[PDB]
Design a protein around this ligand. Structure first.
Ligand SMILES: [Mg+2]
Ligand SMILES: [Mg+2]
Ligand SMILES: [Mg+2]
Ligand SMILES: [Mg+2]
Lengths: 212, 204, 125, 222, 219, 224, 196, 195, 196, 195
């Protein structure tokens, strides 16, 4: 698994791979690792697939109840804290979760919280979680600026997952992109890593080590 | 922890009409980390081809060991070793480390120079010989290869038909294994020509 | 536990225990609230039947629920403390979970909900 | 020490067509190297044009299927005989599975049917309720022998158009019900040849707008 | 694996299945499990295959050298001893489980050899994962001093029981009939399952595979 | 979680044209000690069902009491208790299966393997297995423990698939069952010579045979 | 396993059941556990089949080489060779052996060698898993200087009970009679001894 | 979390707490504030098990803020520290204990004195002139034992603290990504933004 | 421990040794293991002393309360109460109990309840560590409808052998005779039973 | 030891190796050179178990120096790497295996080519354009995969190496105290004294 999310001028970019493995066996290459909590909030899947799916879908239910009761969009702070407080009750029972809760509101602006199954809740600008996280971080840290365009930020997220998909055995399949704005997230397609690798190699001149 | 799946990779061998084919992926890794995309697993001693999967240090060591032994064989016998004879040499050599074995999956492929008969064989890490006429598989995607080979394979394929069969068997098996891929090579072997083809595949 | 339905309907569709609670409010000292353009003022009556009072330590009529919200009341003083405590606890619980202080409307809705609950729960007035 | 889990073997396969879906499974039930039965049905019609199989530990499998069938029955009672859509069935099964997150149903569940647009649908679940809509999914013992073949033959993976040499992919043309059944039968024939736990019989349930049909085929008994 | 042997009126009948496995996968569907020891003695093997293959080959070689020196046919007891003493010395670490049958100057003999180095001398025996299925057939129908074709059918019927009822056993049935006057090595004696027929041809057309580079070297 | 103490070995069974046969020996073992020699492990329920139980004997005795209570309970306010609303084999099985799976799910299993043999109202043969894990399955022949490994291979030669059931008479089926019991006595170290056998036929009803013995035993080849 | 050796007036008789188990599976129901190490020195074997066979073969070799050099060994000598092997390799062996033999000078003698490799000369000895169930019976019913027929009955009745109660014992009751007259083998089938 | 230091000088308490948050292989953040304001003149830093640290700190904060509103009064640092100790002492025999260590730096407005309390996850409370949790004391205490004076100014306290952090940066194997420093005095709590 | 109960013509007799050990130390050499739960319903106790005493006291209470309401309980009823306690608490108990009693209607009855909490009605029963050594003896020597004197001899001889071979058994042989005539206690000392 | 990196450019091989030596609690040294010159145009860096690393490196050095004197000839980098691999492959089935990972950077004077060999403690040899041992590759390989060209100059190789070390200093939890960098080319081996 490789998942990332980062804050920038134009909101948030979320990018994930698509691979799921049981040991060395590749179970699926078509896993949806971005959970669409609601039209304005996104979450990322790492650790336990069920734990992430179940509890972030549940989170969407809690966010919906909040806005019915309070007649106002839930803050990313409040939404993330509902999830972190829930998993904290289950601490010790064996939940497995490493997620980025991503949203863009008026009062906060673009906001990302890293939430985690041992209770951690961290606000931050750049997060990378999964077996291929270290590979993605390298590309992110050396190319990240606040003043990136939406086009360039989308590519940077795509390229960073590709880096991890190449090197990490347990990351691959395809890349799913999202752009989170104040008016909601926008899906920017599924991109096969096989086809993407060769396309990027040629156009960028990278991966000279690999014969194409 | 498991020595046979630290580095990853696969080998497959097949028989056809007056020919054999042997193929392997090019990956070497340290568990999750991909390390090399140029780690070939097929070697040859004269006209006998040997593929080896498993622990990469043992792959290299055994190649060096069989080069050593087949070189001395040739000097003494005044002829190149044959696939049937070599198969027994591999088995013997593996079993002499019965209680401290090499963690490998060897596969032999070749055509007997005198009879013209296509030959393929496989072994377990301690030398038990799997002697089958259709196909031999080995590595971390051996299950996947068994599945591909059982449904794609048919007997008496012409060299270029056999190339397509073994290539598709390798490629699609490798793509369902985290620890295999990163390139692939296919040898098409006839009685007095050998064609080596590198395949284009996904690099994740 | 004591389960007795004290707040019930009468033939004319009235809940007398709720209506008699309003009579306790009528007896209480007068409280007034006026909002300006950029402020709110809470005025409260102190009955001068009680002199020799220590005004330093006597419970004041206006209570802070948080640093930004206040509550005043008319009626039973002892009863008001229970609503004030619950409201103060809820104000801190709201800050803890939502990471934002209560709106005035939210705090009101909570207090009003506690008051309602005590009109259709067994064993309570 | 008492081990509450066991392994009854078995292999299942779900494929979603354009206007149909199939869910197949072998009829062999085993423990270790013994055969318990050569014909123990594993794929079930659950009503509302939904077929289900929960492969792995058969006791947990039977329990889950029984609870889901009951969930369909109560859905009708509680919501004015409304048809349970395949997507709604899938989410309901997630909650059934996740309810036992800390003492799981030791099964790999697959359901099949038609979505609300009449198009073929397959959903696949892990033991604790994570799920996804899929085109093609094998489960159980010989899944690793079947899926690579399906990648190649259904989705035309690693196949390119002759003459172009890797430049143009083979196009993804739609398969008929007859074509899918051929692939299912040959997938199980190959799995039977190479996996000891696979054999005896193959039972396929086919779902269309007309309803649920069954087909049965003999498999090798050794 | 299901391997078995019986003693009949004129000699020994040995039987074996042909399935070889890797885990739960079948690596070879037609593996020969009946092994030559000497011209009058054969071995059926189960257990760790490399061990069985190597242990039988070694004892066969040593018996050959013994027989060259003595100038007479080797005996089954000497094959039994040599196997037994070696297996005992290695304390079960060589997982060779054998059915040893042959015909001597002293007549026909049948042994079962276990990995730890114990042996049993019996009129009928079974070994491997299919032993119980095979033994059920023997307990049901074995009698001493059977005629050849009767004994052949019983052994075949015993191996079949293992093939069908044991997941670890499968494939064809192989026999070896040993008597003073002959040695019949019947491979395969029976084919109880047809290979599954495939309905489609999934073999790709030429040029389907994407090739980076090619090289041709003649010989 | 416990461990089985006093135990019963194989229960074997099969279907034939008009009904079912089930059998089990009369031994209650205490480890290697052959402690109790008069234990009945086939327990009839009405005149249409026989439940054969292997494994822990204390748990068997508990199950025996549950089945006795089930018959009592079914008779309550039931004018058709001996007719249309009598207990069916399928009812008795489903109950036991529910109990077995519930008990495993509380990590406190009934340490048994059970085979319910009977004939339904419509004349259909019933034969189904359930064990300590709640695992269930049906087959033309069923057997527990050793029986699975040695009896099934013999019984399957008589009824190999569903279509062989109408071709199998009660004489052929009983012979096979009795022959299988002999083989188990030769080869199971926790078996006994003495056994019980029960036939449930759609025409002749329930025949319960006690105090049977394994006979026609071949030992003579031992002397050589 | 149920094994015993009993001295009587004319010599000694060894007795044994024929059951060999792998867990609950009877791997051999017609096993011969009475094994010959010399003409009139035999032994009963219990424990690991591999160990007791290996030991017995080594002993037979030792006594054969003894005989070539020094003539017929005593039963005591045979027991000593068994003991030497069992004691010195106690860590790697699981062998409970009873040694019985007939001299003309000493007549019938019985030596039991339990797990530790100690030696105990006795009028009679019992061993194997099934022996536990007949300590009471054998102690009450053994007499010295019994006849051949009495000793056959004593062994038959004893092992009958051992077989009845021990699941690890069963099959036929084999016996070997050792007297001046020679070596006689006896066998008794289930239908005979079960009705006793 | 890793390093938390505390020093009580003449007229203030200074708390220094590391900025790194490491989850196994990677450093996820390098600007984390391991502190909560409990009341206007009382600051609590913390370090221990992931999740439990923040959960505990915020829980304490909520309770002290509740007390402040109810009584319209700020509890003394001693009172807050005793409350905190009791909560940790209660925790240690629980089903799942809070694995959290704290320093409480407060200015007592009644006594006009700075106060530093050190409390470990067992509920072991001590009042100190300077304190630390984990391995932080092993490196720093020899320097504090040498240089510390009770009459130090706030500026002298910060300099002695710089020397402690330098020693930590030299001899500790872990990169803790520097420290956020906060001062607690009569005027309240403020952060030193350049350190 | 060596315990047994044997039905005979006039009723039933319970028998037991008197040795209680902590490892190899004899903590009580004169233990009474024959315990009264009702006038003519007694039991023999083996296993954990704490468990079997606790159980027996609970049973005595149950049967006392039964008697107050419904009159004299049957021996079967007594066994059932023992079984209920032993089966339902099998995980936390180590108790092997033989229940023996005399009705006028049913006469002498013996029920054995082994470790699992199963019940087995038998003509006679043996239990305890020492019982293993007398399975052979007891099976050969038991007859139905023996006299009082014959049954006393059978129990005396049986437990004598159990004591001789089992280190965990010893001391005096206690017996309790249950007939229409009443309840008779018997004791037999080492000097008497060792010479048998 | 911790981080060892290697990069083969157009005309040289550059090895970068960390300076820290940590013994559990304390950093004992911050200037340790984790390298040995095997021959004038062949350099070996190393990392693994304490003691075994230096013992192995010096043992290899001694053997190559012996070969050089006996034959009056410098072995090719390929030959030295094969010798090293065999010694490690021999070691892995020993009574006590050398737990040592190495990079061999050499300039082949016959072929006029730089060569980089990566060998782990099992004897797993690979020739690479760039390599690393332990966790170092996890952080750095994505950068090298992006930027690396076979025709890079030595100065461009050092810049790409700086970027790799910066990423390591940002995301690695351990303070490895910077790196000593050495260049291997046709003229021999030299150390970059400012990095
Ligand atoms: Mg990858
Ligand atoms: Mg791959
Ligand atoms: Mg099969
Ligand atoms: Mg027996």
């Amino acid at each position: 698994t490789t998942t990332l999310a980062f804050r920038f001028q134009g909101g948030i970019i979320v990018a994930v791979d698509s691979r799921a493995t049981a040991g060395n066996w590749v179970a699926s290459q078509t896993v949806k690792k971005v959970i669409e909590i609601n039209p304005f909030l996104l979450g990322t899947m790492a650790g336990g697939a069920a734990d992430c799916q179940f509890w972030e879908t549940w989170l969407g239910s809690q966010c919906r109840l909040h806005e019915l009761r309070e007649k106002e969009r839930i803050s990313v702070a409040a939404a993330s804290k509902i999830l972190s407080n829930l998993v904290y009750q289950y601490k010790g029972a064996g939940l497995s979760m490493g997620t980025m809760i991503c949203g863009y509101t008026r009062k906060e602006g673009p906001t990302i919280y890293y939430v985690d199954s041992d209770g951690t809740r961290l606000k931050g600008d750049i997060f990378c979680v999964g077996s291929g996280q270290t590979f993605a971080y390298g590309v992110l840290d050396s190319n990240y600026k606040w003043d990136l365009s939406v086009e360039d930020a989308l590519y940077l997220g795509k390229r960073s997952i590709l880096a991890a998909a190449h090197r990490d055995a347990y990351s691959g399949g395809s890349v799913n992109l999202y752009h989170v704005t104040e008016d909601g997230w926008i899906y920017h397609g599924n991109h096969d890593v096989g086809e993407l690798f060769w396309k990027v190699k040629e156009e960028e001149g990278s991966f000279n080590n690999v014969i194409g | 922890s498991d020595p046979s799946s630290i580095n990853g990779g696969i080998v497959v061998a097949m028989t056809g009409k007056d020919c054999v084919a042997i193929a392997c992926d090019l990956r070497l890794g340290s568990q999750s980390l991909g390390v090399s995309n140029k780690f070939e697993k097929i070697f040859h001693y004269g006209h006998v081809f040997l593929g080896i999967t498993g622990l990469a240090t043992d792959v290299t060591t055994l190649n060096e060991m069989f080069r050593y032994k087949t070189n001395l064989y040739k000097l003494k016998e005044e002829r190149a070793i044959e696939p049937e004879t070599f198969t027994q040499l591999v088995s013997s050599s593996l079993y002499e480390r019965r209680f401290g074995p090499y963690f490998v999956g060897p596969v032999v492929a070749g055509i007997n120079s005198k009879s013209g008969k296509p030959f393929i064989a496989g072994f377990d890490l301690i030398g038990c010989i799997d002697e089958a006429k259709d196909f031999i598989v080995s590595g971390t995607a051996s299950d996947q290869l068994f599945g591909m080979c059982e449904s794609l394979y048919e007997p008496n394929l012409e060299p270029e038909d056999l190339f397509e069969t073994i290539s598709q068997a390798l490629l699609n098996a490798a793509d369902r294994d985290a620890l295999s891929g990163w390139g692939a090579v296919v040898y098409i072997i006839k009685k007095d020509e050998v064609v080596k083809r590198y395949l284009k595949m996904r690099q994740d | 536990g004591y389960d007795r339905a004290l707040s019930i309907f009468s033939p004319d569709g009235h809940i007398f225990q709720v209506e008699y609670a309003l009579e306790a409010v009528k007896r209480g000292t007068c409280a007034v609230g006026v909002k300006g353009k950029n402020c709110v003022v809470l005025g409260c009556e102190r009955r001068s039947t009680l002199k020799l009072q220590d005004t330093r330590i006597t419970p004041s009529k206006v209570s802070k629920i948080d640093s930004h919200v206040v509550l005043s009341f008319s009626g039973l003083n002892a009863d008001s403390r229970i609503l004030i405590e619950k409201a103060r606890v809820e104000a801190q619980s709201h800050r803890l979970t939502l990471e934002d202080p209560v709106t005035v409307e939210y705090l009101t809705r909570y207090v009003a909900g506690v008051q309602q609950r005590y009109t259709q729960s067994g064993g309570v007035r | 020490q008492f081990n509450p889990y066991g392994d009854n073997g078995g292999t299942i396969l779900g494929i979603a067509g354009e206007d149909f879906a199939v869910l197949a499974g072998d009829t062999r039930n085993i423990t270790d190297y013994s055969i318990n039965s050569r014909y123990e049905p594993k794929v079930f019609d659950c009503g509302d044009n939904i077929v289900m199989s929960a492969n792995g530990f058969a006791a947990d499998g039977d329990a889950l299927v029984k609870r889901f069938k009951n969930s369909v029955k109560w859905y009708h009672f509680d919501h004015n005989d409304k048809k349970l859509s395949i997507n709604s069935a899938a989410r309901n099964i997630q909650h059934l599975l996740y309810g036992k997150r800390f003492f799981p149903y030791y099964v790999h569940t697959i359901i099949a049917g038609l979505d609300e647009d009449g198009k073929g649908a397959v959903y696949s679940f892990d033991p604790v309720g994570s799920y996804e809509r899929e085109q093609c999914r094998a489960g159980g013992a010989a899944a690793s022998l079947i899926m690579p073949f399906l990648d190649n033959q259904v989705n035309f993976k690693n196949q390119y158009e002759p003459g172009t040499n890797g430049k143009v992919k083979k196009p993804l043309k739609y398969l008929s019900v007859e074509e899918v059944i051929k692939l299912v039968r040959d997938s199980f024939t190959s799995a039977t040849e190479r996996h000891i736990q696979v054999g005896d019989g193959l039972e396929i349930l086919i779902v269309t707008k007309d309803g649920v049909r069954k087909e049965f085929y003999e498999l090798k008994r050794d | 694996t299901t391997i078995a042997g019986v003693v009949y009126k004129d000699g020994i009948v040995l039987g074996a299945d042909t399935r070889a496995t890797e885990g739960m996968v079948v690596a070879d569907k037609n593996c020969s499990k009946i092994h030559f020891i000497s011209p009058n003695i054969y071995c059926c093997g189960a257990g760790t295959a490399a061990d069985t293959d190597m242990t039988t080959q070694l004892i066969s070689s040593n018996l050959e050298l013994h027989s060259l020196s003595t100038g007479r046919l080797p005996r089954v007891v000497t094959a039994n001893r040599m196997l037994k003493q070696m297996l005992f010395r290695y304390q079960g670490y060589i997982g060779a489980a054998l059915v040893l049958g042959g015909v001597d100057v002293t007549g026909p003999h049948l042994y079962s050899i276990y990995p730890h180095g114990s042996t049993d001398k019996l009129p009928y025996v079974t070994m491997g994962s299919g032993s119980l299925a095979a033994m059920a057939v023997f307990e049901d129908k074995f009698r001493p001093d059977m005629e050849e074709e009767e004994a052949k059918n019983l052994v075949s019927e015993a191996i079949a029981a293992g093939i069908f009822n044991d997941l670890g056993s499968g494939g064809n049935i192989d026999l070896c009939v040993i008597s003073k006057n002959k040695l019949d090595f019947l491979r395969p004696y029976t084919v109880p399952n047809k290979k599954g027929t495939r309905l489609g041809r999934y073999r790709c057309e030429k040029g389907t595979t994407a090739v980076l580079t090619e090289k041709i070297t003649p010989l | 979680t416990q461990q089985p103490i006093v135990t019963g070995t194989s229960v074997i069974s099969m279907k034939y044209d008009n009904g079912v046969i089930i059998a089990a020996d009369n031994l209650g073992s205490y480890g290697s000690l052959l402690r109790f020699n008069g234990v009945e492990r086939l327990i009839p329920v009405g005149d249409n069902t026989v439940v054969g139980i292997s494994g822990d004997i204390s748990d068997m005795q508990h199950i025996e009491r549950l089945l006795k209570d089930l018959v009592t309970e079914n008779a309550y306010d039931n004018p058709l208790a001996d007719a249309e609303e009598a207990l069916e084999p399928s009812y008795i099985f489903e109950y036991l299966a529910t109990v077995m799976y519930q008990r495993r799910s509380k990590m406190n299993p009934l340490w048994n393997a059970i085979i319910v043999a009977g004939v339904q109202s419509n004349g259909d043969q019933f034969l189904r297995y359930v064990n300590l894990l709640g695992v269930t399955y049906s087959s033309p022949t069923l057997a527990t423990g050793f029986g699975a490994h040695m009896a099934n291979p013999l019984l399957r030669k008589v009824v190999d698939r569903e279509s062989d059931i109408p071709k199998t008479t009660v004489q052929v089926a009983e012979e096979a069952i009795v022959n299988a019991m002999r083989v188990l006595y030769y080869r199971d170290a926790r078996s006994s010579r003495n056994f019980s056998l029960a036939i449930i036929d759609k025409n002749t009803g329930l025949t319960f045979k006690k105090n049977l013995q394994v006979e026609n035993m071949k030992w003579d080849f031992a002397k050589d | 396993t149920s094994i015993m050796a009993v001295t009587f007036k004319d010599g000694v008789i060894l007795g044994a059941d024929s059951r060999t188990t792998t867990g609950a599976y009877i791997a051999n129901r017609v096993t011969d556990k009475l094994t010959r190490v010399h003409d009139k020195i035999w032994c009963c074997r219990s424990g690991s089949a591999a160990d007791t066979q290996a030991i017995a073969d080594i002993v037979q070799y030792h006594l054969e080489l003894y005989t070539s050099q020094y003539g017929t060994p005593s039963t005591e000598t045979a027991a000593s060779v068994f003991k030497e092997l069992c004691y010195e390799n106690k860590d790697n062996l699981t062998a409970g052996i009873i040694v019985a033999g007939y001299d003309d000078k000493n007549k019938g003698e019985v030596y039991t060698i339990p797990l530790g490799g100690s030696v105990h000369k006795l009028p009679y000895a019992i061993a194997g898993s099934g022996s536990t169930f007949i300590y009471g019976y054998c102690d009450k019913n053994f007499r010295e200087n019994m006849s051949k027929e009495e000793t056959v009955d004593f062994i038959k009745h004893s092992l009958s009970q051992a077989i009845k109660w021990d699941g690890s014992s069963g099959g036929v009751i084999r016996m070997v009679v050792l007297t001046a007259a020679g070596v006689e083998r006896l066998i008794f089938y289930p239908d005979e001894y079960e009705q006793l | 979390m890793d390093i938390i230091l505390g020093i009580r000088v003449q007229d203030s308490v200074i708390l220094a707490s590391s900025k790194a948050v490491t989850r196994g292989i990677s450093v996820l953040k390098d600007s984390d504030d391991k502190t909560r304001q409990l009341s206007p003149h009382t600051l609590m830093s913390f370090a221990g098990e992931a999740g439990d640290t923040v959960q505990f700190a915020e829980y304490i904060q909520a309770n002290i803020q509740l007390y402040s509103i109810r009584e319209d009064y700020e509890l003394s640092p001693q009172a807050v520290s005793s409350f905190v100790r009791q909560e940790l002492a209660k925790s240690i025999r629980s089903r799942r204990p809070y694995q959290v260590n704290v320093l409480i730096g407060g200015y007592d407005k009644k006594k006009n004195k700075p106060e530093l309390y050190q409390i470990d996850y067992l509920g072991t409370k001590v009042e100190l002139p300077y304190g630390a949790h984990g391995y932080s004391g092993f490196y720093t205490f020899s320097l504090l034992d040498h240089h510390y004076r009770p009459d130090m100014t706030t500026e002298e306290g910060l300099d002695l603290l710089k020397l402690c952090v330098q020693e930590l940066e030299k001899r500790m194997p872990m990169d803790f990504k520097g420290v956020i420093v906060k001062i607690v005095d009569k005027d309240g709590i403020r952060q030193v933004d350049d350190f």
